[PDB]
Structures are given as structure tokens and as C-alpha cells.
Design a protein around this nucleic acid. Structure first.
Ligand SMILES: [Cl-]
Ligand SMILES: [Cl-]
Ligand SMILES: [Cl-]
Ligand SMILES: [Mn+2]
Ligand SMILES: [Mn+2]
Ligand SMILES: [Mn+2]
Ligand SMILES: [Mn+2]
Ligand SMILES: [Mn+2]
Ligand SMILES: [Mn+2]
Ligand SMILES: [Mn+2]
Lengths: 106, 84, 99, 95, 98, 77, 104, 92
DNA sequence: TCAATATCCACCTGCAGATTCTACCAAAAGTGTATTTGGAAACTGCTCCATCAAAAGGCATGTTCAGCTGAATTCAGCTGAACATGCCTTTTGATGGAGCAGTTTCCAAATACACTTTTGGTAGAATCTGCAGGTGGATATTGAT
DNA sequence: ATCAATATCCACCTGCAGATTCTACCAAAAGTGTATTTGGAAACTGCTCCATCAAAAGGCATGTTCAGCTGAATTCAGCTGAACATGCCTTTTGATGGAGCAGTTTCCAAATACACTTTTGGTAGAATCTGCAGGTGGATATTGA
């Protein structure tokens, strides 16, 4: 009776997948047993972290379904995610409302 | 069918104007419209070149989403949304 | 009889209108030709995946909307409120594109 | 005759429920998410291969992955990242 | 008596330095700066004799570039004196901040 | 110790940079950016020393870090 | 019999073939790959040393030093693009003074 | 023993400028150069391979890589210079 | 222009100080032979792309007007460059004793590996429901008077 | 300081296009039994790296002057925003034909594995060559009357 290694480390992400992609993707000669685990986690975490802010953004816009816009707003307001994804662009994302100060009426 | 000729003029003014509002610009110098096409054309080329190159190296007669993406990636202009 | 806004009122109006939206601002078809056209001139008889185009438009508009801010910053940096070619050359120059 | 394609799609959904039971995610958004994962994956794994190489070692241990993360992620996000990481490895090792 | 009008030595200065390729920051101070910064990360650290040069080079080299971009920003604003603001726009554009 | 980078130096720099006039305010603002630069380079470099299980920071460490930061440096292996 | 001289080059096809199977680039490496690459490498090295060389003479020296390599690069547009995000140690910039700053 | 393209570069040098020499630091620069290019070409080569599910990097890859990496004419001369080098090796 | 002053370019000139050529050797490339295997040369399967039609009104284009922006000038309060001075970290030139970066030489643990079960993951038709696209009364803001 | 005139706001509303579930296949994780080898783990060896010690000198820091730059304040010609009428496309949705992308089948030519021979390609070593940096006259430039 077998159990996914994902649960062994109790992760929601496919720990087996990660290990495979680490090999099918040739990054190194060999690959430790925890490498797929650790990474799998870091991935699950990051995905979990931006889904949290997206859903919030989705809750503010008053709807129950995350869409690209929400992921933009999420990623664009959190300093740290914005830097991780600085040279990235979210299709259908848009920009953060922002009129330069000096343009407004006086 | 018909021959594709000078279609950059398609990227009208109302549009370039728009792309510029979402950009935050309130007042647009009239010479801007021709400059934008100037750059849009260069950008579009560079991305598309790399794309097709990818298309060719894969001995294909079709440009695919991934091509355009491995392209943007290469160009350091990483896109998400078709990425797979 | 009739009404009329002072110049700038609709500009700031639109700026708000389009920053709150995430629809592509360029017309699809015109953009498609341009794309096929350019491609046409590298390898003929290329066929594009319905999305390959969308990807490009999505990428293009974003590059520019992005280019326009850095531009607007340069107009304002010279105490101007109207972006000018002078401003795009700088943005791009500093970015490292057309050094 | 089928050619089934992969995706991290099912799992994003598992995590979405964990942080927003009632909230749902659109196809396109799911797509954006799925990209995010592979990008980050590629980055970390890459940064890893390099460490391992730069260090004449022929294998990527979960220790490389970590230093990869520390090098890749910005501060706070890295703390948390590393945290959840070790927590999963140690737990794992204990069958 | 004699004196060169304002902003003329500078030019002779530009031409000077642009012509050379020698480092400008002072070695010792820079090391003290390096080592000091490194502390916040790891203590009792030794730096390869050249590991500092690498830093020294990369550094002067980075600043000079940032300056050129700053000078263009000053000029673009009709000025001729680089100011903090220029240095900023320069960077807000490079993607280094904001 | 960042005040160690004397004014005259920051100025020679702005010279090679092609700058003619300089706002006295620059000098601190410049000392500012510079430290960030080094903080960034070294943190990523040291991390390399660290993972490398060393107590000595080599040129390579600095080099690899520079590459990371997109400031590739040629001339030090 | 050195695979290199065989392909008529100065660069190490052999070594290069070795570095390829190391870098973890792909499971296996084609026979011509090393050669092809080596050439491409030798080429650019030639293109650079040449220009740089001229700079050395244009200055009147006979030893090519970084400053010459630097001039050689940023002066030529293509190379300058290839090595756009790279910085030559002990390079210096290229003489350049914006018009506006100029006297009289 | 630590290796480098120090000698090869020297050969190419004495082959286009027999008359001139080359500073150590310049050699160290030139040396840092080959390596970079090497990595760039080999990486893009590697990805070319992967994207297309191929498990072997051929000349075809390198070439394309080179097409993608090197700008304008620099591209072409290299490709040529490369394909040339290929046939001439295969002949002997 | 005319000089008086100060920087700068240019033949010209004698050495360590790096440079470059040697004289020998492990590491590495060549080769021989033999054992896999990636993936290129045919063949259909059958999506996904090209095109074409057609009717509609979303938008683009072009024009008239004139609000207010950019750009040209004018002005003088001073900031920051040129310059002269005085005092002091920086450069440097070994020297010392050793913290450490590295080289081996094994070896127990950690991985790769090859097969056989044992499932999650997918793809594909159910079966739902967010929320898009209008529809209309309130704000809220603008700009005329 | 009011009061039309518009545009922005939200709350409802309701069908369907885009999810969210609900069931049948395998490509692929999961076991287990080996076979391989990776990278610490002692342990030893020389670098290279701090850490003093002591002088001369650029270099830096201050303080004095004032040239001319940056800034603020008007001003006016024109450009660029607004609004409107015109009618040219871009959308929209579906239909059809078919290039060619993409699952199989095979063979081959090509790449990888061992391990056994030569050559290199590095290392100090030994024998050179240059650009150094000091002169010091001879213009070039600046700058002021
Ligand atoms: Cl591991
Ligand atoms: Cl300022
Ligand atoms: Cl090949
Ligand atoms: Mn054409
Ligand atoms: Mn104005
Ligand atoms: Mn199941
Ligand atoms: Mn709605
Ligand atoms: Mn067919
Ligand atoms: Mn030899
Ligand atoms: Mn000299």
C-alpha cells in the first residue's frame, strides 16, 4: 500500500512531478531525495501566497472568481511579489490605477 | 490573398492615444503618433523574428504561442497567459 | 446649449477609464495584418496560431503602455505635461534599448 | 491518439480552496498561475544547477534548492519560503 | 592674476578622466566600506585580494554609467547640473527602483 | 564608513560620466545608491561564499553575483 | 589528428566537446556541435582582437590592453550590442561630451 | 592545474596581428569573453533542444542559437565560419 | 587682435616589471571496438487555420474652435566651481604566523537503475452558476453665469 | 454662490458561456532488490590573508570669491483637446476546405560506453621587451584689456 511522497512531506503539490522535471529537464547529473520536496514546497507556498492576495482583490472588486486583473493588482501592490515578477507581464492584467500627481487639476 | 502592405498605419491614432492614457499620459504631442509606430514596429519585429526563428528550427510552417513566448522570454519581456 | 469640458477634463477622465480596464486597446484585425505582414517578410507562407497573435498583441500593448509611463515621467521631469518624441528617445535611451 | 498535456492546474485549485474555500478561479487566470509556477520552477532549478556546477558538485541537493531560493526570492518571501521548505523536507524524511 | 572661468576646469577634467581608465575611488576607504557591509551578512570574513577589485571595478563602472544617464536627465530638463531628482528618474526608468 | 568615499571621488566619477556641473546634494544621494549597489552585490556574493562552505570571499563569488545582478564583469575569471 | 586542426581551427574542439557534456546542456552532444561552436568562438575572438589590435596601433602601442578592447567594442555597434550588459575591467568610457555642455 | 583559452586566443592574435602582443589583464578579459559567449550559445542551444523534445545538441542547434544570440552581420559571418568549419572537419 | 598665464602634446630617453619563450610532465584528447539509441523517413489521423459571406454600428477621420500649454524672455538670489592652504589619511613595502582553501584516500549513505504493481491526472461529456450587458434611479463633478 | 449638463455609480436582473463536477482510461508515480559513486570525513600541506610598523606625499578638507545657473513670473502664438457629423471598416458567427501538426512504425547512422595509447596544455623557469614617467620645449587654449 503506497502513498504519494507529497503527503509524506504533506504538500498539496506533486512532489513526484517536480523530481521528474528536475531530471527530464537536465539541470544536474543527479538529484537528491529532498530537492523535489523542498522546491515543491517553495512552489506551493508562492502559489498559495499570491492566491491569497488575488482572492482578496477578487473579494474587493465584489466577485467570487479570481481573474487575471485580480492577479495583477495582487502582484502589483505587494512590494515583494512585484519585484519577483518585475520583468513579467500578465496577459489581460492591466495596470494599477495611478494618475501622476502633477497632472491633476489645481 | 491581397498583398500585405504598410499596415502599421493600422495602429491608428485613437489607439496610440489610448495605450497612452492607460499609461497615464494626459497631453500628447502630435509628433508622438508617428514615433510610437516607429517603436511598435521595431519591437514587433524583434519579437517576431526570434519567434519565427524558433518556428524554423522546429521545421514547422506555423508560428505557435510557445514560439511567441520563448521569444518574449528571450527578449527579457516574459509573458504569462499562453505560457502553456 | 451646448455643454463643453475644459481641456484636460476628459483626458483625466479617459486615463481613469482605461486604467480600470484590461481590454486590448488596438483593433485586432489591423494588428493581425501588421503581424502577418512583418512575419511575411522573414519567411513566407507562415501560418499563425490564433493565439500566437493574441500573445503578441498582449505583449505589444503592454510594452507600450509601459513605455508611455516612463515617457510621461520624462515630460514631467522637464516641467511639461505633454509627452514628446524627445521624451520617448530618453525613456528608451535610458532603458538601454536604443543607446 | 490522445496526447494528454500536463499542468499544475489541479494543485493550484487545491491550494485555492485552502486559502479561499468559496472563491473560484477562471481559465485564463489558472493559465497565468500555471505559468507563474513553471517560471519560478525554472528559475530556482536553474539557479540550482549553477550553484551545483559552480561548486564542482554533480548533484542538486535540497540544500542547493534552498540557497537557490535565498538568492532568488526577496527577503520576507524568502523567509517564509525557506520555512515551508525545511518543514516539508524534515517532515518527509521521517517517513 | 589668472583664473579659469567657471565650468572650464570641469571640461578639462571630463576629457581628463574619460581618457584614463584608472580607478577613482580610494582603495583603502573602499575596502573598509566593503568589509563593513559584508558584516551584516557574515562575520570574520576574508576577501580575496582581487575579490575587492572586482567589487571596486563593478562599482565605479556602475556609478559612471548611472551618471551618464543622470546627466542626460539633467540636460533633458533644460539644466546642466545633475541633481538628486535626475539620478532618481534615471533609476526609476532603469527599473532599479519603483 | 560610507562617508569614506570622499566628495572629490564622487566628482571624478561624474566626470568620467560626462557631468559638468554638480548639485552639492548629489554627494549624499550618490553615497546612497552606491551602498545599495554593494549591499546587493555582496549579499548575493557572500551567499555564494556561504553555500560554498567557506570563510573567504573569492573573486568568483563577486563575479557570479555580478552576473546574477545583470552586471556581468569580464577580467576576473 | 587533433579534431581541431582537422576542422582547421586554433580553438579546442576537443575541450569544447568536453565542456558541453559537463554543462548539463543536453543528454548527448552531436559530433559537429563542438566544432561548430569552437569555430563561432574563434571567429568572434578574431573579430575582436583585430579591431582591438587597430586600436592598439591607433594609440601607437604594440600590447593590446583592456582600454583597447573596450574602445574596440563600444566603437563597433554589433559587438557593442553583443556585449551590451557586460563591463570590461580597466576599460574606461569612450570620449563623449554632450553638445549642450560645450563652451563658446 | 587551472585551464583557460589563454593559449588559443594568443594563436588567433598572432594570426591577425603577428606584430602585436596582449596584456595579461587583456587576456583575462578576452578569456572571460570566450566563456561568456560559450555559455550563452550553449544555453540557448540547450533550450532549443528541450523546447523541441530533443535529447542531443547538434550543429543545427548551435547555429540557430548563434542566429538568435548574435546580432546582424556578426550573426552571418559566425554561422558561415561555423558551417565552413563543419564540412572541412567532416571531410578529413 | 593683442599678449600673460597655464595646460597640453610630443620627440627622446634608459629599466625593472610584466611579458613571452622554454623545458618538462599529469590530464586529457584521440582511437579502437562494441553497445545502445535518438529521431529522421514514410504514413494517416483530423485539429486548427485560412477565407469568405454578410449586416451592423463601433470607431475612425476630418473639421471647427479656442483653452491653456509650451516656449521665449527677463531678472538676481545665490549655489557651486576655481583657487589657494594646511594637515592627514592613503599608498606601499616587506614581514609573520597561520587561518583556510584544497588534495587525497576511503567508504557508509545516498542515487541511479531495471521491473512490476498501484494509482492520481487527464480528457470528455454531465450539470451547474458567476457575472456580462442592459436598464434606471441616485450621487458627484463640471463649468456656465 | 446657484444650477443645468454629463458622467460615474451601484443595486437589480436573467440567460448562457465558462466553469465545476462526474465517471472511464493509462502514462507515471510507487515499491523492492541491487549496482554504482558521491561527497563528506579524517588529515596534511602550503598558500594567501590579516595584522602590525614606519615613513613621505599626494589628496582632502576649508574657507574665500563671484561667475552665470537655476528659478520664478510674464506673455503670446499655436498647438492639441473637445465635440460633431460622416460613413468606412472591424466585429461577429458560421461555414468549408485542407495544410500540416502530430500521434506511430521503423531502421540507421550516430552517439555513448570502456580502457588503452599517445599529445597537449599548464607550471614554474629563464631570457627578454615595453610602456613607464620624467624632460622641457613648443605650441594650443583661456582669458582679460
Ligand atoms: Cl536532497
Ligand atoms: Cl532634487
Ligand atoms: Cl552534430
Ligand atoms: Mn511584404
Ligand atoms: Mn507653461
Ligand atoms: Mn483514483
Ligand atoms: Mn455589469
Ligand atoms: Mn495533408
Ligand atoms: Mn605542448
Ligand atoms: Mn609616457
Amino acid at each position: 500500500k503506497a502513498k504519494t511522497r507529497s503527503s509524506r512531506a504533506g504538500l498539496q503539490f506533486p512532489v513526484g512531478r517536480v523530481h521528474r522535471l528536475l531530471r527530464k529537464g537536465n539541470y544536474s547529473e543527479r538529484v537528491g531525495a529532498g530537492a523535489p520536496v523542498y522546491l515543491a514546497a517553495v512552489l506551493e507556498y508562492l502559489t498559495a501566497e499570491i492566491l491569497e492576495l488575488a482572492g482578496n482583490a477578487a473579494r474587493d472588486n465584489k466577485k467570487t472568481r479570481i481573474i487575471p486583473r485580480h492577479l495583477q493588482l495582487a502582484i502589483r501592490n505587494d512590494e515583494e511579489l512585484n519585484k519577483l515578477l518585475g520583468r513579467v507581464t500578465i496577459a489581460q492584467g492591466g495596470v494599477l490605477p495611478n494618475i501622476q500627481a502633477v497632472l491633476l487639476p489645481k | 490573398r491581397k498583398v500585405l502592405r504598410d499596415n502599421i498605419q493600422g495602429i491608428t491614432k485613437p489607439a496610440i492615444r489610448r495605450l497612452a492614457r492607460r499609461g497615464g499620459v494626459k497631453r500628447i504631442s502630435g509628433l508622438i503618433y508617428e514615433e510610437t509606430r516607429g517603436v511598435l514596429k521595431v519591437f514587433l519585429e524583434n519579437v517576431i523574428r526570434d519567434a519565427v526563428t524558433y518556428t524554423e528550427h522546429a521545421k514547422r510552417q506555423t508560428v505557435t504561442a510557445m514560439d511567441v513566448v520563448y521569444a518574449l522570454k528571450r527578449q527579457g519581456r516574459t509573458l504569462y497567459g499562453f505560457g502553456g | 446649449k451646448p455643454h463643453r469640458y475644459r481641456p484636460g477634463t476628459v483626458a483625466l477622465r479617459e486615463i481613469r477609464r482605461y486604467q480600470k480596464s484590461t481590454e486590448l486597446l488596438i483593433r485586432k484585425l489591423p494588428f493581425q495584418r501588421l503581424v502577418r505582414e512583418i512575419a511575411q517578410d522573414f519567411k513566407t507562407d507562415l501560418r499563425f496560431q490564433s493565439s500566437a497573435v493574441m500573445a503578441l498583441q498582449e505583449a505589444c500593448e503592454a510594452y507600450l503602455v509601459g513605455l508611455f509611463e516612463d515617457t510621461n515621467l520624462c515630460a514631467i521631469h522637464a516641467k511639461r505635461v505633454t509627452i514628446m518624441p524627445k521624451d520617448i528617445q530618453l525613456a528608451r535611451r535610458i532603458r538601454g534599448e536604443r543607446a | 491518439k490522445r496526447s494528454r498535456k500536463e499542468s499544475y492546474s489541479i494543485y493550484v485549485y487545491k491550494v485555492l480552496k485552502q486559502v479561499h474555500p468559496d472563491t473560484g478561479i477562471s481559465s485564463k487566470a489558472m493559465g497565468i498561475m500555471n505559468s507563474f509556477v513553471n517560471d519560478i520552477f525554472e528559475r530556482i532549478a536553474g539557479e540550482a544547477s549553477r550553484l551545483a556546477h559552480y561548486n564542482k558538485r554533480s548533484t542538486i541537493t535540497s540544500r542547493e534548492i534552498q540557497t537557490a531560493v535565498r538568492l532568488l526570492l526577496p527577503g520576507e518571501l524568502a523567509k517564509h519560503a525557506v520555512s515551508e521548505g525545511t518543514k516539508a523536507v524534515t517532515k518527509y524524511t521521517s517517513a
